[PDB]
Short mmCIF file of all heavy atoms in Angstrom, two decimals:
data_model
loop_
_atom_site.label_atom_id
_atom_site.label_comp_id
_atom_site.label_asym_id
_atom_site.label_seq_id
_atom_site.Cartn_x
_atom_site.Cartn_y
_atom_site.Cartn_z
N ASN A 123 84.79 119.99 98.05
CA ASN A 123 84.33 118.64 98.64
C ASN A 123 82.83 118.51 98.59
O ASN A 123 82.27 117.49 99.03
CB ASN A 123 85.02 118.36 99.94
CG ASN A 123 84.64 119.39 101.02
OD1 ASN A 123 84.39 120.59 100.68
ND2 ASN A 123 84.64 119.01 102.21
N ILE A 124 82.14 119.58 98.18
CA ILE A 124 80.69 119.61 98.14
C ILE A 124 80.28 119.29 96.68
O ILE A 124 80.76 120.00 95.76
CB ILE A 124 80.03 121.01 98.49
CG1 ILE A 124 80.41 121.30 99.92
CG2 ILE A 124 78.57 120.94 98.37
CD1 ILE A 124 79.77 122.62 100.39
N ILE A 125 79.63 118.23 96.47
CA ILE A 125 79.17 117.74 95.12
C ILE A 125 77.61 117.92 94.93
O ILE A 125 76.84 117.19 95.51
CB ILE A 125 79.61 116.30 94.91
CG1 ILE A 125 81.06 116.17 94.95
CG2 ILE A 125 79.00 115.77 93.57
CD1 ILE A 125 81.60 114.79 94.88
N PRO A 126 77.25 118.90 94.14
CA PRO A 126 75.88 119.20 93.79
C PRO A 126 75.25 118.19 92.88
O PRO A 126 75.85 117.81 91.96
CB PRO A 126 76.02 120.63 93.11
CG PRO A 126 77.26 120.46 92.36
CD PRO A 126 78.19 119.87 93.44
N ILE A 127 74.06 117.83 93.20
CA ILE A 127 73.30 116.88 92.47
C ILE A 127 71.86 117.35 92.34
O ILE A 127 71.11 117.35 93.38
CB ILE A 127 73.30 115.43 93.10
CG1 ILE A 127 74.81 114.99 93.18
CG2 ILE A 127 72.47 114.48 92.28
CD1 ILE A 127 74.99 113.71 93.96
N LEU A 128 71.37 117.68 91.15
CA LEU A 128 70.07 118.13 90.90
C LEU A 128 69.23 116.89 90.92
O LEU A 128 69.30 116.08 89.99
CB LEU A 128 69.95 118.90 89.56
CG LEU A 128 68.69 119.77 89.39
CD1 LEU A 128 68.83 121.02 90.27
CD2 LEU A 128 68.51 120.17 87.96
N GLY A 129 68.33 116.73 91.94
CA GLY A 129 67.49 115.56 92.02
C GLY A 129 66.36 115.63 92.99
O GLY A 129 66.20 116.66 93.65
N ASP A 130 65.57 114.53 93.07
CA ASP A 130 64.46 114.41 93.90
C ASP A 130 64.82 113.34 94.95
O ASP A 130 65.03 112.23 94.61
CB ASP A 130 63.29 113.98 93.10
CG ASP A 130 61.98 113.83 93.85
OD1 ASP A 130 62.00 113.88 95.13
OD2 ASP A 130 60.90 113.76 93.27
N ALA A 131 64.91 113.76 96.23
CA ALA A 131 65.20 112.85 97.35
C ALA A 131 64.28 111.69 97.44
O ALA A 131 64.55 110.65 98.01
CB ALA A 131 65.41 113.60 98.60
N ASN A 132 63.11 111.82 96.84
CA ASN A 132 62.09 110.79 96.83
C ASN A 132 62.32 109.73 95.80
O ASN A 132 61.62 108.72 95.76
CB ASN A 132 60.69 111.44 96.70
CG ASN A 132 59.52 110.46 97.08
OD1 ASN A 132 59.60 109.77 98.04
ND2 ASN A 132 58.52 110.42 96.22
N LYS A 133 63.36 109.94 94.99
CA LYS A 133 63.70 109.01 93.91
C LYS A 133 65.26 108.88 93.92
O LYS A 133 65.94 109.31 93.08
CB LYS A 133 63.34 109.53 92.54
CG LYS A 133 61.82 109.85 92.35
CD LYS A 133 61.57 110.21 90.95
CE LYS A 133 60.27 111.09 90.79
NZ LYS A 133 59.09 110.41 91.37
N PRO A 134 65.83 108.21 94.99
CA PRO A 134 67.20 108.01 95.15
C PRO A 134 67.92 107.22 94.11
O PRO A 134 69.08 107.38 93.90
CB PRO A 134 67.30 107.42 96.61
CG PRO A 134 66.16 106.72 96.72
CD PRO A 134 65.05 107.64 96.13
N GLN A 135 67.15 106.35 93.44
CA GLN A 135 67.72 105.48 92.44
C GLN A 135 68.21 106.29 91.21
O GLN A 135 69.15 105.84 90.57
CB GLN A 135 66.63 104.48 91.90
CG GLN A 135 65.48 105.06 91.21
CD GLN A 135 64.37 105.56 92.18
OE1 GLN A 135 64.44 105.49 93.37
NE2 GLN A 135 63.31 106.09 91.53
N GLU A 136 67.68 107.49 91.07
CA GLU A 136 68.14 108.36 89.94
C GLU A 136 69.53 108.85 90.08
O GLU A 136 70.21 109.15 89.09
CB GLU A 136 67.12 109.51 89.81
CG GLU A 136 65.78 109.10 89.18
CD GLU A 136 64.92 110.32 88.84
OE1 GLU A 136 65.12 111.38 89.38
OE2 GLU A 136 64.03 110.14 87.95
N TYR A 137 70.02 108.99 91.29
CA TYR A 137 71.41 109.50 91.46
C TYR A 137 72.30 108.42 92.14
O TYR A 137 73.40 108.71 92.60
CB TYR A 137 71.45 110.79 92.30
CG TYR A 137 70.56 110.84 93.55
CD1 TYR A 137 71.04 110.32 94.76
CD2 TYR A 137 69.33 111.44 93.51
CE1 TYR A 137 70.25 110.45 95.89
CE2 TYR A 137 68.49 111.54 94.64
CZ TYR A 137 68.96 111.06 95.84
OH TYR A 137 68.18 111.16 97.00
N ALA A 138 71.91 107.15 92.10
CA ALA A 138 72.67 106.06 92.68
C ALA A 138 73.97 105.71 91.93
O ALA A 138 74.84 105.04 92.45
CB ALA A 138 71.80 104.85 92.77
N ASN A 139 74.13 106.12 90.71
CA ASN A 139 75.35 105.95 89.94
C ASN A 139 76.39 107.10 90.19
O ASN A 139 77.44 107.11 89.52
CB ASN A 139 75.11 105.81 88.47
CG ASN A 139 74.70 104.31 88.05
OD1 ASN A 139 74.74 103.43 88.88
ND2 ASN A 139 74.24 104.22 86.81
N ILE A 140 75.97 108.00 91.12
CA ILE A 140 76.88 109.14 91.38
C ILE A 140 77.26 109.12 92.87
O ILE A 140 78.43 109.30 93.20
CB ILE A 140 76.12 110.55 91.13
CG1 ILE A 140 75.57 110.54 89.81
CG2 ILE A 140 77.13 111.67 91.36
CD1 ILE A 140 74.65 111.82 89.53
N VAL A 141 76.29 108.93 93.77
CA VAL A 141 76.49 108.87 95.12
C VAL A 141 77.03 107.58 95.63
O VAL A 141 76.29 106.49 95.57
CB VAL A 141 75.19 109.25 95.94
CG1 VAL A 141 75.42 109.26 97.46
CG2 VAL A 141 74.70 110.62 95.54
N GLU A 142 78.18 107.51 96.19
CA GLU A 142 78.88 106.34 96.67
C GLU A 142 78.28 106.04 98.03
O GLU A 142 77.63 106.94 98.61
CB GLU A 142 80.36 106.45 96.70
CG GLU A 142 81.00 106.98 95.41
CD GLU A 142 82.35 106.38 95.12
OE1 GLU A 142 82.83 105.52 95.87
OE2 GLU A 142 82.96 106.86 94.11
N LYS A 143 78.50 104.83 98.61
CA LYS A 143 78.03 104.56 99.90
C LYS A 143 78.51 105.62 100.94
O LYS A 143 79.65 105.96 100.89
CB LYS A 143 78.43 103.10 100.39
CG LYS A 143 77.62 102.08 99.79
CD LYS A 143 76.12 102.17 100.16
CE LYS A 143 75.33 100.89 100.04
NZ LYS A 143 75.17 100.36 98.64
N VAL A 144 77.57 106.15 101.74
CA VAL A 144 77.90 107.16 102.64
C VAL A 144 77.94 106.75 104.10
O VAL A 144 77.39 105.76 104.48
CB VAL A 144 76.90 108.40 102.49
CG1 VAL A 144 76.94 108.93 101.07
CG2 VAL A 144 75.50 108.00 102.96
N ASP A 145 78.60 107.57 104.93
CA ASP A 145 78.75 107.22 106.38
C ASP A 145 77.64 107.89 107.14
O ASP A 145 77.19 107.49 108.17
CB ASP A 145 80.07 107.82 106.90
CG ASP A 145 81.29 107.22 106.12
OD1 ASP A 145 81.59 106.08 106.41
OD2 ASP A 145 81.82 107.95 105.36
N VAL A 146 77.12 109.06 106.64
CA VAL A 146 76.08 109.84 107.29
C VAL A 146 75.12 110.46 106.29
O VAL A 146 75.57 110.86 105.20
CB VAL A 146 76.71 111.01 108.17
CG1 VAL A 146 75.61 111.79 108.81
CG2 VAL A 146 77.71 110.44 109.16
N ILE A 147 73.88 110.49 106.64
CA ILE A 147 72.87 111.15 105.87
C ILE A 147 72.32 112.23 106.75
O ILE A 147 71.97 111.99 107.87
CB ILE A 147 71.74 110.19 105.43
CG1 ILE A 147 72.17 109.14 104.36
CG2 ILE A 147 70.68 111.01 104.78
CD1 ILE A 147 71.15 108.20 103.93
N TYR A 148 72.34 113.49 106.32
CA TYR A 148 71.78 114.62 107.03
C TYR A 148 70.63 115.08 106.27
O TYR A 148 70.69 115.42 105.10
CB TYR A 148 72.78 115.72 107.19
CG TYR A 148 72.31 116.98 107.94
CD1 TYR A 148 72.42 117.05 109.29
CD2 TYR A 148 71.61 118.02 107.23
CE1 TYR A 148 71.85 118.15 110.02
CE2 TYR A 148 71.03 119.08 107.92
CZ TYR A 148 71.21 119.19 109.36
OH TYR A 148 70.73 120.21 109.99
N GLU A 149 69.37 115.10 106.85
CA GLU A 149 68.14 115.47 106.24
C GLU A 149 67.43 116.60 106.98
O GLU A 149 67.24 116.64 108.21
CB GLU A 149 67.20 114.30 106.15
CG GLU A 149 65.99 114.62 105.45
CD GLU A 149 65.07 113.46 105.22
OE1 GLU A 149 65.56 112.25 105.16
OE2 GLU A 149 63.84 113.60 105.10
N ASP A 150 67.05 117.60 106.16
CA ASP A 150 66.35 118.77 106.59
C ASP A 150 65.25 119.12 105.53
O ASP A 150 65.38 120.08 104.80
CB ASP A 150 67.29 120.03 106.76
CG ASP A 150 66.59 121.30 107.31
OD1 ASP A 150 65.56 121.14 107.86
OD2 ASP A 150 67.22 122.34 107.19
N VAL A 151 64.24 118.34 105.50
CA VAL A 151 63.13 118.58 104.55
C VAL A 151 61.81 118.55 105.28
O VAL A 151 61.44 117.51 105.98
CB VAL A 151 63.16 117.59 103.34
CG1 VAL A 151 64.48 116.84 103.22
CG2 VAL A 151 62.00 116.60 103.36
N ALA A 152 61.11 119.64 105.29
CA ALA A 152 59.84 119.80 106.02
C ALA A 152 58.69 119.28 105.17
O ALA A 152 57.93 119.99 104.53
CB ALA A 152 59.64 121.28 106.37
N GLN A 153 58.53 117.94 105.11
CA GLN A 153 57.45 117.27 104.39
C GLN A 153 56.92 116.14 105.23
O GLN A 153 57.60 115.57 106.07
CB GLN A 153 58.04 116.75 103.09
CG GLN A 153 58.45 117.82 102.12
CD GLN A 153 59.06 117.25 100.88
OE1 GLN A 153 59.03 116.04 100.61
NE2 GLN A 153 59.63 118.06 100.03
N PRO A 154 55.57 115.79 104.97
CA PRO A 154 54.96 114.69 105.63
C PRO A 154 55.67 113.37 105.46
O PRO A 154 55.55 112.48 106.34
CB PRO A 154 53.57 114.66 105.02
CG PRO A 154 53.39 116.01 104.51
CD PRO A 154 54.73 116.36 103.96
N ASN A 155 56.41 113.16 104.36
CA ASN A 155 57.14 111.92 104.03
C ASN A 155 58.59 111.94 104.31
O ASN A 155 59.32 111.10 103.85
CB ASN A 155 56.86 111.53 102.62
CG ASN A 155 57.45 112.51 101.60
OD1 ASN A 155 57.69 113.66 101.91
ND2 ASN A 155 57.66 112.07 100.33
N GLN A 156 59.07 112.93 105.10
CA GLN A 156 60.46 113.08 105.38
C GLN A 156 61.14 111.87 105.95
O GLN A 156 62.26 111.50 105.62
CB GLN A 156 60.71 114.29 106.23
CG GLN A 156 60.04 114.32 107.62
CD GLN A 156 60.17 115.64 108.33
OE1 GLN A 156 61.25 115.94 108.81
NE2 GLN A 156 59.08 116.42 108.27
N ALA A 157 60.40 111.15 106.88
CA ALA A 157 60.93 109.99 107.43
C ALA A 157 61.10 108.80 106.48
O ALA A 157 62.21 108.21 106.40
CB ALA A 157 60.07 109.52 108.63
N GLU A 158 60.18 108.55 105.65
CA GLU A 158 60.31 107.50 104.62
C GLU A 158 61.39 107.83 103.64
O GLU A 158 62.04 106.93 103.11
CB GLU A 158 58.92 107.16 103.88
CG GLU A 158 58.61 108.23 102.91
CD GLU A 158 57.58 107.75 101.79
OE1 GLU A 158 58.08 107.15 100.80
OE2 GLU A 158 56.34 107.88 102.04
N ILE A 159 61.56 109.14 103.34
CA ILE A 159 62.75 109.56 102.49
C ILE A 159 64.04 109.20 103.07
O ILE A 159 64.94 108.82 102.34
CB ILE A 159 62.64 111.15 102.19
CG1 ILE A 159 61.42 111.47 101.36
CG2 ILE A 159 63.88 111.65 101.58
CD1 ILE A 159 61.28 112.97 101.03
N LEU A 160 64.19 109.39 104.39
CA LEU A 160 65.48 109.05 105.02
C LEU A 160 65.73 107.56 104.97
O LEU A 160 66.86 107.14 104.60
CB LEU A 160 65.44 109.46 106.50
CG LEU A 160 66.81 109.20 107.29
CD1 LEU A 160 67.85 110.10 106.83
CD2 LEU A 160 66.51 109.45 108.82
N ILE A 161 64.63 106.79 105.15
CA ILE A 161 64.68 105.37 105.11
C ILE A 161 65.02 104.84 103.76
O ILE A 161 65.86 103.94 103.59
CB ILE A 161 63.36 104.72 105.60
CG1 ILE A 161 63.14 104.97 107.12
CG2 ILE A 161 63.37 103.24 105.33
CD1 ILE A 161 61.76 104.62 107.58
N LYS A 162 64.48 105.45 102.72
CA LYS A 162 64.59 105.10 101.28
C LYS A 162 66.10 105.35 100.96
O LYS A 162 66.76 104.55 100.29
CB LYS A 162 63.70 105.89 100.42
CG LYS A 162 63.43 105.26 99.05
CD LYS A 162 62.50 106.11 98.19
CE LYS A 162 61.13 106.35 98.87
NZ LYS A 162 60.22 107.16 98.03
N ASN A 163 66.59 106.52 101.33
CA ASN A 163 67.94 106.95 101.00
C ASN A 163 68.95 106.11 101.80
O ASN A 163 70.07 105.86 101.33
CB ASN A 163 68.14 108.43 101.25
CG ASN A 163 67.70 109.21 100.05
OD1 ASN A 163 68.44 109.56 99.17
ND2 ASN A 163 66.38 109.45 100.05
N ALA A 164 68.62 105.66 103.03
CA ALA A 164 69.47 104.83 103.85
C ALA A 164 69.67 103.49 103.25
O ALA A 164 70.78 102.91 103.22
CB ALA A 164 68.86 104.71 105.24
N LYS A 165 68.58 102.91 102.73
CA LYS A 165 68.57 101.56 102.06
C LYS A 165 69.56 101.65 100.89
O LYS A 165 70.44 100.75 100.67
CB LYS A 165 67.22 101.10 101.57
CG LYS A 165 66.18 100.82 102.55
CD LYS A 165 64.85 100.48 101.92
CE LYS A 165 63.72 100.19 102.90
NZ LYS A 165 63.85 98.91 103.67
N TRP A 166 69.44 102.72 100.12
CA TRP A 166 70.26 102.88 98.90
C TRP A 166 71.73 103.30 99.19
O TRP A 166 72.63 102.63 98.60
CB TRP A 166 69.65 103.96 97.97
CG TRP A 166 68.61 103.43 97.17
CD1 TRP A 166 67.23 103.41 97.36
CD2 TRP A 166 68.73 102.87 95.87
NE1 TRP A 166 66.61 102.93 96.36
CE2 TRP A 166 67.43 102.43 95.33
CE3 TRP A 166 69.84 102.58 94.96
CZ2 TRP A 166 67.25 101.86 94.16
CZ3 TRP A 166 69.67 101.97 93.72
CH2 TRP A 166 68.29 101.61 93.37
N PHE A 167 71.96 104.23 100.07
CA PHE A 167 73.27 104.69 100.29
C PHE A 167 74.00 104.60 101.68
O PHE A 167 75.22 104.65 101.76
CB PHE A 167 73.41 106.24 99.92
CG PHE A 167 72.76 106.52 98.64
CD1 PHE A 167 71.52 107.19 98.56
CD2 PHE A 167 73.29 106.05 97.40
CE1 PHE A 167 70.87 107.45 97.31
CE2 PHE A 167 72.69 106.30 96.22
CZ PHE A 167 71.50 106.98 96.14
#
């Protein structure tokens, strides 16, 4: 039930044809832009 996707979380549009709309996004990335990444992925998925 775990589906691996080689990608860059900062470019969610690249895996948008694979990831269906989700109920929850869990993020654990220690970066200065981690918040905007969650927001970007939330808009998309």
Side-chain angles (χ1 to χ4, degrees):
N123 57 332
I124 298 182
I125 296 172
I127 299 170
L128 198 73
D130 182 346
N132 194 44
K133 302 184 205 304
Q135 66 278 0
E136 290 190 336
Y137 47 85
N139 278 348
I140 307 173
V141 181
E142 308 212 8
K143 280 300 200 293
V144 303
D145 302 285
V146 181
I147 291 180
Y148 179 89
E149 181 176 334
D150 182 18
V151 345
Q153 293 178 11
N155 64 341
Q156 61 189 285
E158 75 158 272
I159 287 178
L160 181 68
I161 292 169
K162 201 181 303 181
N163 279 265
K165 289 177 185 289
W166 278 91
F167 314 110

